[PDB]
Design a binder for this molecule. Structure first.
Ligand SMILES: *C/C=C(C)/C=C/C=C(C)/C=C/C1=C(C)CCCC1(C)C
Ligand SMILES: CCCCCCCCCCCCCCCCCCCC
Ligand SMILES: CCCCCCCCCCCCCCCCCCCC
Ligand SMILES: CCCCCCCCCCCCCCCCCCCC
Ligand SMILES: CCCCCCCCCCCCCCCCCCCC
Ligand SMILES: CCCCCCCCCCCCCCCCCCCC
Ligand SMILES: CCCCCCCCCCCCCCCCCCCC
Ligand SMILES: CCCCCCCCCCCCCCCCCCCC
Ligand SMILES: CCCCCCCCCCCCCCCCCCCC
Length: 236
């Protein structure tokens, strides 16, 4: 029997695709509206939504067109993590990019941590999927991942926060907003993992992907816009 939740998530994957495609085009069109020194801010933001767009395009093949639960296949975990592996670092660079051999140590710390977080997650999810339920590898990977994540938040609310003050108001204020994305917006994913780790089922997975879809829109388009307006405001 055809499933309404399945049809719904099929639709939402298109929403992700179109939202990401549209953000991508916005950033690319408004790039020359920027001083030549700020254009990289738009390009990096566009590259991220672009990657997420390709991710959401290929989700169409994971669910399929059937509407049947049992028809759900593909490699949606790999698709999502390859997206995450590329986009999360490209999102984190927006911090030292707004700041300015003086923003490179911060960047280096951000990305090592981020890489530990993402691949930890991948190892854990893959183990959970293969077993069809809780594994301790699934638990410890996660915890290590969360540690990396908390380390990132620490840098943003200390290192980044302090350097922010030495920047012009609209850049400083953007940087301070951006932090909350990583603290609150990014919290959605490890929460979704926790549910997955302790509550198996295809349907709950579809719901997590739904929520991730909104998280992503916020954390990629939203987060990109914030930084883009600062560099346009400071382009006068
Ligand atoms: C655009 C995609 C984004 C912003 C994805 C962010 C992903 C995370 C913040 C992942 C977090 C995880 C942990 C904090 C612990 C280990 C499990 C991970 C992958 C889910
Ligand atoms: C006038 C200033 C010229 C810079 C304009 C924008 C150039 C692009 C900024 C960096 C792009 C990042 C490229 C990442 C490649 C990732 C491959 C994987
Ligand atoms: C600059 C990085 C470009 C990343 C390409 C898009 C990755 C998301 C789609 C992955 C499809 C993987 C199938 C296995
Ligand atoms: C621009 C939108 C492209 C949609 C192509 C859909 C391909 C068939 C899906 C099955
Ligand atoms: C330098 C990062 C190496 C991968 C870390 C994996 C996290 C724990 C997996 C077990
Ligand atoms: C060159 C400076 C490199 C600093 C690397 C900082 C890495 C932080 C470790 C992340 C959390 C580990 C969790 C296990
Ligand atoms: C000013 C920018 C704030 C970004 C927050 C984005 C996430 C809000 C989603 C509601 C709460 C999510 C649960 C955690
Ligand atoms: C953040 C993930 C929350 C998933 C909850 C799923 C509950 C709906 C099951 C139908
Ligand atoms: C069957 C176990 C019930 C508890 C599931 C916990 C899900 C929320 C994790 C946070």
């Amino acid at each position: 029997e055809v499933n309404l939740l399945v049809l719904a998530t099929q639709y939402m994957f298109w929403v992700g695709f179109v939202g990401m495609a549209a953000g991508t085009l916005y950033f690319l069109v408004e790039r020359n509206s920027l001083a030549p020194e700020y254009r990289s801010t738009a390009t990096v933001a566009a590259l991220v939504t672009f990657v997420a767009a390709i991710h959401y395009y290929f989700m169409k093949d994971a669910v399929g067109t059937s509407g049947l639960l049992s028809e759900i296949d593909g490699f949606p975990t790999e698709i999502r993590y390859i997206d995450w592996l590329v986009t999360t670092p490209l999102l984190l660079v927006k911090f030292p990019l707004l700041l300015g051999r003086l923003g490179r140590p911060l960047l280096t710390k951000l990305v090592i941590a981020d890489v530990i977080m993402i691949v930890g997650g991948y190892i854990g999810e893959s183990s959970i999927n293969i077993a069809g339920g809780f594994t301790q590898l699934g638990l410890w990977s996660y915890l290590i991942g969360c540690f990396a994540w908390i380390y990132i938040i620490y840098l943003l609310f200390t290192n980044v926060t302090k350097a922010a003050e030495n920047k012009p108001a609209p850049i400083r204020d953007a940087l301070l907003k951006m932090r909350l994305f990583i603290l609150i917006g990014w919290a959605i994913y490890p929460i979704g993992y926790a549910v997955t780790l302790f509550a198996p089922g295809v349907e709950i997975q579809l719901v997590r992907e739904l929520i991730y879809n909104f998280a992503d829109l916020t954390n990629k388009v939203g987060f990109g816009l914030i930084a883009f307006f600062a560099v346009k405001t400071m382009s006068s």
